[PDB]
Amino acid sequence: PKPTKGPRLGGSPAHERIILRNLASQLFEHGRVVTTVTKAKRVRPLAEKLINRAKTDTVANRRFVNRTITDRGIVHILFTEIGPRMEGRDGGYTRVTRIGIRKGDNAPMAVIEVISDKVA
Amino acid sequence: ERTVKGVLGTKLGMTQLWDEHNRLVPVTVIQAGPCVVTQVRTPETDGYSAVQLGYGAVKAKNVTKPEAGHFEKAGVTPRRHLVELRTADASEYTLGQEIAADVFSESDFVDVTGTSKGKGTAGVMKRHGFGGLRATHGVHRKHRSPGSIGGCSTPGKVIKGLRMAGRMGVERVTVQNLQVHSVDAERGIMLVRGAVPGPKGSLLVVRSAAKKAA
Amino acid sequence: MIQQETRLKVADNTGAKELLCIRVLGGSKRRYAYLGDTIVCTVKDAIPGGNVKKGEVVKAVVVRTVKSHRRPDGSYIKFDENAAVLLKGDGEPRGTRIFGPIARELREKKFMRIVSLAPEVI
Amino acid sequence: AVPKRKMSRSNTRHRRSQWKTVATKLVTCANPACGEKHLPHTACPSCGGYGPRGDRRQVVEA
Amino acid sequence: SNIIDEIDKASMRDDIPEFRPGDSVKVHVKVVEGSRTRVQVFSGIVISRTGGGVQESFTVRKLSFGTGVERTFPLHSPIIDKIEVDRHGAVRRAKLYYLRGRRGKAAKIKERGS
RNA sequence: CUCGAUGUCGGCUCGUCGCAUCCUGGGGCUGGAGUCGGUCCCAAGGGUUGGGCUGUUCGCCCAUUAAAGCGGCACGCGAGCUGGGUUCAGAACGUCGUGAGACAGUUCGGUCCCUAUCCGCUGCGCGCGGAGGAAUCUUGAGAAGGGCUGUCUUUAGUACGAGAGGACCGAGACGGACUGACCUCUGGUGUGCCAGUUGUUCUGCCAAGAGCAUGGCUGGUUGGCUACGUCGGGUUGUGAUAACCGCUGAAAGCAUCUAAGCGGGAAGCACGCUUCAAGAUAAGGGUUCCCACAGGAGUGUUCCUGGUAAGGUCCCCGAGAGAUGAUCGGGUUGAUAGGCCAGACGUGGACGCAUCGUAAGGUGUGGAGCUGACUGGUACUAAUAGACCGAGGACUUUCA
RNA sequence: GUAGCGAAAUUCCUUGUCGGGUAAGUUCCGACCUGCACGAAUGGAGUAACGAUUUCCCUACUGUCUCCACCAUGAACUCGG
RNA sequence: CCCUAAACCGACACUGGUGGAUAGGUAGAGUAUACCGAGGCGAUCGAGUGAAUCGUGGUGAAGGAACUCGGCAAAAUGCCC
RNA sequence: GUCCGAACCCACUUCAGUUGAAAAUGGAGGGGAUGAGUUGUGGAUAGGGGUGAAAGGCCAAUCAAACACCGUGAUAGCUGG
Ligand SMILES: [Mg+2]
Ligand SMILES: [Mg+2]
Ligand SMILES: [Mg+2]
Ligand SMILES: [Mg+2]
Ligand SMILES: [Mg+2]
Ligand SMILES: [Mg+2]
Ligand SMILES: [Mg+2]
Ligand SMILES: [Mg+2]
Ligand SMILES: [Mg+2]
Ligand SMILES: [Mg+2]
Ligand SMILES: [Mg+2]
Ligand SMILES: [Mg+2]
Ligand SMILES: [Mg+2]
Ligand SMILES: [Mg+2]
Ligand SMILES: [Mg+2]
Ligand SMILES: [Mg+2]
Ligand SMILES: [Mg+2]
Ligand SMILES: [Mg+2]
Ligand SMILES: [Mg+2]
Ligand SMILES: [Mg+2]
Ligand SMILES: [Mg+2]
Ligand SMILES: [Mg+2]
Ligand SMILES: [Mg+2]
Ligand SMILES: [Mg+2]
Ligand SMILES: [Mg+2]
Ligand SMILES: [Mg+2]
Ligand SMILES: [Mg+2]
Ligand SMILES: [Mg+2]
Ligand SMILES: [Mg+2]
Ligand SMILES: [Mg+2]
Ligand SMILES: [Mg+2]
Ligand SMILES: [Mg+2]
Ligand SMILES: [Mg+2]
Ligand SMILES: [Mg+2]
Ligand SMILES: [Mg+2]
Ligand SMILES: [Mg+2]
Ligand SMILES: [Mg+2]
Ligand SMILES: [Mg+2]
Ligand SMILES: [Mg+2]
Ligand SMILES: [Mg+2]
Ligand SMILES: [Mg+2]
Ligand SMILES: [Mg+2]
Ligand SMILES: [Mg+2]
Ligand SMILES: [Mg+2]
Ligand SMILES: [Mg+2]
Ligand SMILES: [Mg+2]
Ligand SMILES: [Mg+2]
Ligand SMILES: [Mg+2]
Ligand SMILES: [Mg+2]
Ligand SMILES: [Mg+2]
Ligand SMILES: [Mg+2]
Ligand SMILES: [Mg+2]
Ligand SMILES: [Mg+2]
Ligand SMILES: [Mg+2]
Ligand SMILES: [Mg+2]
Ligand SMILES: [Mg+2]
Ligand SMILES: [Mg+2]
Ligand SMILES: [Mg+2]
Ligand SMILES: [Mg+2]
Ligand SMILES: [Mg+2]
Ligand SMILES: [Zn+2]
C-alpha cells in the first residue's frame, strides 16, 4: 500500500518490510496481536489487502499471497478461515484498539484483531 | 481609493491549453463559486468602505450562534469563508447580493491572493538562497552553514533582519497581472493563465489587477 | 545549455573541428547559450590545411544542443551533439557549407544564410 | 560554549518551573458493572472492554 | 478532479491512431513560415509515451544526416495535422532510451506478428 | 588597555554602513556643430561578470558588460569554514661562523578543540492583560520588502554637417541579471511501483516464489520535493525637493531667481506596489451571540467559592500543517483516514492452459497481470464514551 | 675555479630575456650568461629501473564546480527511564 | 572456569591490543568477497517523528576542473583468455 | 632484499572523533607482504649511562639526561597570600 513517509520501523526500510510481513502473519495465525499503536496502524492496510486477496480462492491467488506471509499454514488459515469469513464484508477486515502504555518505555500499545463475526 | 472587483474561489489544480496562436498556456483552475455579500462596510459606521463576502459550503452543526446571527442579519445561508474586499464602490453592493465568477471576462487581468504552501523550518540555503561552503577542500562540518553572522567588537551584536533559518511558507502571496483565460459562469469555473499561491483546495481571492498589466 | 569551457563540434566546412566556449554573449553574468545564441570560442582542433588555425578566437552561433529546447507550442527538440557555426563578425557564416540538421530557432529573423545552406531545418 | 556566570535563583527557577507534566484525565467506564476509570479511546484495564453502554466488546481477557 | 478532466476533454482530439513506443510513425506537423503554412513530416521511431489526458505526449527519434534528432509532441497539440503509423515494432519495454546508444541493425526493431 | 593569551595573511560565506559616484538619473560651463567627450555641481535607489598566473592582497593578461567604484566595520567576519603563506620541532641548497649554529634568503613536509549560560539575531509557543464572557470580519500608529539594466526597430538617413558621419525629445518589440509563487510542461530524485537479471540459501521437489549481497545490480516510473523548468514582478505615476532654471521685484530711480511673493526641476526623499501589524497596555473598530445564577463571610454593595449559558479545550481520525507547541479540517446530524469498488497514472504482456522447439525459449489465450501517493464513489474499520474550563448584567466618576 | 653545469632544492634585483605550451601561464619546459652568492668523494655532470617524494602538462572521468535537488539512515526533535 | 574476551593488558561489562590449534559447502585463483554449514548470536535503554543542521551511504539533466593553494574527495579503470 | 594480492607488519591521504568507543583510534582507500620479513618464550645492556639503518629518537602513556627516596622546609633582587 502507501509508503510510510517518515523514518521506518526497525532502523531500516528492509527491516520494516520484514517486520510488517511477520506482524501480518502473526495476526493471521493468532487472530489478534498486541503490537504497539504505530505497528498496528501500519500493518492494518497490508493485512487487509492480504485478506481481500484471500477472499477469492484460486491457486494463483494463493501463490500471490504466499509471496507475502511465506508460511503455508498461515496461507491455509487465510484462505480457509479468515477469507470465507468476509464474503459480504467490503473492506474493514481488521480493527485496532488502544490498550495502554508499556511500563519500560511508555510505548502506547494496541490490539489489532481480525473481525471475528460474520457480516450476514 | 481604488475600485476593485473581486470573487472568492478554491484552487483545484493546473492544466494546459493552446490559445489562438497555438501557444501552450498553463492555467490554474479556480472554483470561483457563488459569493454572497454578507456585510457592507461604509465610511459612516466602520470608517472605511468594503464588502465582506462569504464563500463555501458549511455543515449547519459546525456554525455557531454568533455566526448564525451574522448570516441571519445578512439574510443568507452560512458560508465557510468570510473575506473583505476593499473597494471604493462598496456602496453599490446590497446585503445578500449574489456575486458569481462572471464578474471577470475572457481577457481581464487579475491579482490572485492566497496562502502559499508551507515548508516547515527551512535552512538558510533553501529559504534564503544562501550558498554554503564547498563539498570538499577541507570544509569541516559546515557545508550548509550561514557563514558569518556579523562583524566583531563593532558592533558587538547581530544586526536586526539578518537572514537565518526558520519556518517558511504558509504566508499571504499575491500574484499580479494574471490573464483570465476563460470563465464558465454556470458551473463557477475560472481558468487563469499562470500559477497561483497555495495548495489544491486552498482559498483564493481573485481581484482586479491593481497595476492593470505590464 | 552551453557554458564556458564547453567543447562543441563544428557544423561548418571552415576547417575547425572543435571549439571551446570562452564566453556566452548577451549580457553580464550570462550563464548558458542555447539554440541561436552567439558565443566566443577558441579553436581547439583544426584541419591542418585550412583557413582557421588552432588557438584562434572566433565567434560562433550555437546549433544542435544536447539538452532540449522548448517551443511555444509546447513541443521540444533535442539533438545528440553540441554544434556551432563560425561567424565573420556580422552574423554571416565564415564557411560555405552547413552540415547536419539545424534548429529552426536559427530562423528567428537572424541567421538566414545558415538556414538556406542547412540540409535539414528542424 | 560554557556558562559565563552562575545562574541566579530567580532565573534558574523561572526555567525549571516549566519542566512539568499534566495530570492524566481519565474517563468512567461505560459498563455499569465496572464503573472504573480508564483512558479515553482506550480499553478499560479493569474489565478489558470498549464501546458504548449499548454495544460493548472485549479487547483484553483481563 | 473529474471537473479537470471534463475541462480537458475540450482540448482532446479523436483522430489519434493506436500506436505504442517502438512503432514507426510519420508526424505531419504544420509549420508557419512567413505568410505561408506548410506541413513538414517528421518520420521516426516512437521511443516514449508520457501519458495522461491532455498532457499526453510522445517522443519520436529520427536519424537525419548522420545525427539523431528527437522531438516531443503533446499528443493533442493543434500543430499536428495527422499521425500515420508505418510499422508496428516488437519491443519489450515502454521507454526505448537504449536506442540512443545504438545504430545500424542494432537500431532496427522487429515487426509485430513475425 | 590587553603577555594567570585581545589568534594573525589571503580566500570562502554572510552582510551592513559612508560617499571621496564606476554604471544608470538630473544639471552648469565648454577650446559643446552632430556622434562622442572633458570638467565640476546634485545624487548612495538598485547594480557593479567569468577566467589564466601567483599563498597571496596588489598587479599583468584573456573574453565580456551599462559598469567591472573607492573605502569603514579588531587592515568586518577561524566558539562560521580553509590553512596555500607566515612564527615550532625533520631535511637540503646558497651565504655567514673554527664550532655549536644563524638568515624578515630560498627549498620539500609539518595535530586549527569547544554539547551556547547571558546579551544579540532568526523562527515558533505558553501565560496574563486589553473593566462581563465569547465568535467572526477588520482599521492602520508603525515596521519590512521591492526600486537594476541592455539591444533592436521607428521617428529619421530627419536636425547638425563641406563630407564622412549622425541625433535629442517621443513610440514599440525582445532580452541579461535579480526575485515571488508554482509543479501544467521539461529535467532530477525515487529504500514504492512494475520488469529483467548474477551469486547463494530456503519454501520437500517440478512449477511458482521468498531472504541476503548498496534498494545486490540493471531498465523505466505516478505522487511529494525540486530547478535545469513554468508563470508573474520592478512600474506607468503623485507631493515636497537637490543641483540648476526662472517670473514679478525692491532695498540700491538701474540691475538683481529673493529680501515680500509665485513656479519648473532627479533612479534620490515620502507615497503609489507587496507583506507584517492594537503587548499601538493609547491594548482600537463593525457585526453577531449568551445573559440578571447558587452558597458563605460580609461592610457603599466588597470579596471568596460552586454549577452553568454563548463559546471553547482535553481526547480520537487526519493534512493542504508541523521539530514540539501551534495551524487547518473531520468526529456517526460523519466521507477525516484506512480498507473496498471503479478509473487514471506506472510497468509492459502474470499464473494456468494450448501450441511449436531436443532444450534454453518463441507464439496465442490477452494492452495480460500487478500496482503507491491522483480522481470519483462507498460507513466495512477507526473516529467510541465522556470530561474540564468558561459571564453575570459585568469597578468607579462625570456627562448626555 | 679546471672539466662540466648554471634564473638552479643555489639568482637579491626577478614575473631577468628569448622560445614552447594556454584565449590568457609570477608556476612549468628549453635555452642565454649578467654565477648577489655552482663546481668536482661535505664529490661534478649524466643516467635505464624504482618512488604513498616534489613539480608542470595531456587524455579519461566525474556533484570539485556552474548550482544544487532528492532518497534512506546514526545523532539532533517529542515521550518514558 | 574465561580465554581473536563482559573474566587477560587497557581506571569501565572500553568499536583498542593479545601467541597457538581445528577450520565444511556453492560461486571463486584464493584462508578475498557473497550467501550458507558445524556451532553460536539478535549486541547490555527504548518508543516515535518525512524540521533545520552534522555524520554515513545513493542518484543525477547540460556542461566537464570553469572548483581549489593543489583534481583534496569522488568517478572512471579494474577479472580471465 | 622479483611482481599482484589476503592473513600478518606498517601508517601515505582523507573524513570522523576531539568532555572520544580510544590519554593517538575508527571508516574509506594506501605501503611491505621469502625478506635488511614478522612474531611467541626466556635472556643481556641502566642514567652523564644504555641503545639508536641517526629523529636528540627510545629507555614502563610528557627524556637536550628516567624514576624513587634522601640533602630538603634547596634557592628565587620574582608573583601570590
Ligand atoms: Mg517518501
Ligand atoms: Mg532509534
Ligand atoms: Mg537489502
Ligand atoms: Mg555547492
Ligand atoms: Mg562533510
Ligand atoms: Mg570570532
Ligand atoms: Mg534569561
Ligand atoms: Mg501510459
Ligand atoms: Mg583572564
Ligand atoms: Mg557628492
Ligand atoms: Mg544603499
Ligand atoms: Mg581582519
Ligand atoms: Mg603549509
Ligand atoms: Mg630544522
Ligand atoms: Mg666554512
Ligand atoms: Mg503604516
Ligand atoms: Mg501531477
Ligand atoms: Mg522523468
Ligand atoms: Mg524451479
Ligand atoms: Mg557496485
Ligand atoms: Mg515528478
Ligand atoms: Mg531681472
Ligand atoms: Mg512598538
Ligand atoms: Mg626568485
Ligand atoms: Mg622566470
Ligand atoms: Mg615566455
Ligand atoms: Mg679536489
Ligand atoms: Mg657545495
Ligand atoms: Mg669536497
Ligand atoms: Mg634522473
Ligand atoms: Mg528524556
Ligand atoms: Mg573488549
Ligand atoms: Mg572466543
Ligand atoms: Mg579489564
Ligand atoms: Mg599481533
Ligand atoms: Mg571457504
Ligand atoms: Mg570472509
Ligand atoms: Mg548450527
Ligand atoms: Mg560464543
Ligand atoms: Mg547499543
Ligand atoms: Mg537491544
Ligand atoms: Mg554496557
Ligand atoms: Mg534513476
Ligand atoms: Mg551530472
Ligand atoms: Mg549525463
Ligand atoms: Mg569530455
Ligand atoms: Mg583553475
Ligand atoms: Mg587547467
Ligand atoms: Mg577561481
Ligand atoms: Mg584521490
Ligand atoms: Mg573511486
Ligand atoms: Mg618482494
Ligand atoms: Mg613492490
Ligand atoms: Mg615505524
Ligand atoms: Mg632482565
Ligand atoms: Mg636537529
Ligand atoms: Mg615514554
Ligand atoms: Mg629535560
Ligand atoms: Mg644535569
Ligand atoms: Mg643543605
Ligand atoms: Zn471497565
Cross-chain CB nearest to B18 (options E1, E3, E77): E77
DSSP state, residue B109: E
Task: Report whether B51 contacts B87 (CB < 8 A).
Answer: yes
> Within D1-62, where are the H helices?
9-16
Q: In degrees to the nearest 10, what's the CA dihedral of B85, B87, B93, B94?
A: 60
Q: Are strands B24-31 and B35-41 parallel, antiparallel or unpaired?
A: unpaired
In our burial notation (b when 16+ CB lie closer than 10 A, e otherwise), range C81-117 reads ebbbbbbeeeeebbbeebbbbbbbbbbeeebeebbeb
Task: Report whether E48 contacts E58 (CB < 8 A).
Answer: yes
Q: Of B105, B111, B102, B104, which is closest to residue B194 (Cα–Cα)?
A: B111
Task: Say whether residue B16 is in contact with chain E using an 8 A CB cutoff.
Answer: yes
Distance C36 CA to H12 C1' (A): 73
Distance E33 CA to F248 C1' (A): 67
Task: Say whether residue E64 is in contact with chain B using an 8 A CB cutoff.
Answer: no
Instruction: Give chain E as a 3 state SS string.
Output: CHHHHHHHHHHCCCCCCCCCCCCEEEEEEEEEECCEEEEEEEEEEEEEEECCHHHCEEEEEEEECCEEEEEEEECCCCCEEEEEECCCCCCCCCCCHHHHHCCHHHCCCCCCCC
Q: Of E57, E70, E65, which is closest to residue E97 (Cα–Cα)?
A: E70
The rounded distance, in Å, linking the Cα atoms of C36 and A86 is 67
Q: Of B140, B136, B118, which is closest to residue B127 (Cα–Cα)?
A: B118
Q: Are strands B166-168 and C16-24 parallel, antiparallel or unpaired?
A: unpaired
Q: Could you tell me the three cell numbers for D28?
A: 468512567
Give ion ligand 3 contacts, CB < 5 A: A 14
Distance from CA of B40 to the nearest CA of C (A): 45
DSSP per residue over C1-19, as a string? Answer: -B-TT-EEEE-BSSSEEEE
* Cβ-Cβ contacts under 8 Å for C86 (sequence gap 6 or more): C10, C12, C14, C16, C52, C58, C59, C60, C93, C94, C95
- Sequence spans of domains, chain A: 1-120
The boundaries of the domain holding residue C111 are: 1-122
Q: Of C106, C102, C88, C91, which is closest to residue C14 (Cα–Cα)?
A: C88
For helices A59-67 and A37-54, angle between their N-to-C axes, nearest 10 degrees: 160
With cell 459562469, the residue in question is B185
- Burial label for A89, CB within 10 Å (0-12, 13-18, 19+), is middle
Cβ neighbours of A65 (radius 10 Å): 21
Q: Which residues of chain E from 51 to 80 reach within 8 Å of chain C, CB to CB?
A: 64-74, 77-79
Distance from CA of E79 to the nearest CA of B (A): 7
Distances (CA, A) of B145 to B7, B96, B103: 44, 55, 49
Q: Of E102, E68, E64, E75, which is closest to residue E21 (Cα–Cα)?
A: E75
With cell 506541413, the residue in question is E39
The rounded distance, in Å, linking the Cα atoms of B131 and C15 is 43
Report how many domains make up chain D.
1
Distance A108 CA to F42 C1' (A): 75
Instruction: For chain A, list the strands marked E by DSSP.
Output: 32-34, 94-101, 108-114
Collect all residues of chain D within an 8 Å Cβ-Cβ radius of residue A97: 42-43, 50, 59
The rounded distance, in Å, linking the Cα atoms of A119 and A96 is 18
Query: What order do you get walking across the sheet with E57-64 strand by strand?
Result: C69-70, C76-79, E67-74, E57-64, E36-50, E24-33, E80-85
Report how many domains make up chain C.
1
B117 Cα–ligand 17 center, Å:
16
* Residue C110 three-state SS: coil
The rounded distance, in Å, linking the Cα atoms of A96 and A20 is 15
Instruction: Give B41-91 as a 3 state SS string.
Output: ECCCCCCCCEEEEEECCCCHHHCCHHHHHHHHHHCCCCCCEEEEECCCCHH
CA angle B14, E6, E18 (to 5 degrees): 95
Answer whether any strand H atom is within 7 A of the Cβ of B120: yes
* Cβ-Cβ contacts under 8 Å for D26 (sequence gap 6 or more): D37, D38, D39
Distances (CA, A) of E51 to B183, E47, E60, E76, E83: 27, 13, 15, 11, 17
**Any idea which ligand is nearest the CA of D11?**
7
The rounded distance, in Å, linking the Cα atoms of E109 and C9 is 30
C35 Cα–ligand 36 center, Å:
60
Task: Say whether residue D47 is in contact with chain A using an 8 A CB cutoff.
Answer: no
Cβ neighbours of C67 (radius 10 Å): 13
Q: Could you tell me the three cell numbers for B180?
A: 483570465
The rounded distance, in Å, linking the Cα atoms of A99 and A102 is 10
With cell 545562574, the residue in question is D7
Task: Report whether E84 contacts E25 (CB < 8 A).
Answer: yes
Q: Could you tell me the three cell numbers for B58?
A: 458549511
CA angle A108, A109, A115 (to 5 degrees): 140
Q: Determination method here?
A: cryo-EM
End-to-end CA distance of chain C: 18
Give the resolution value in Å: 2.5
* Residues recorded for chain B: 214
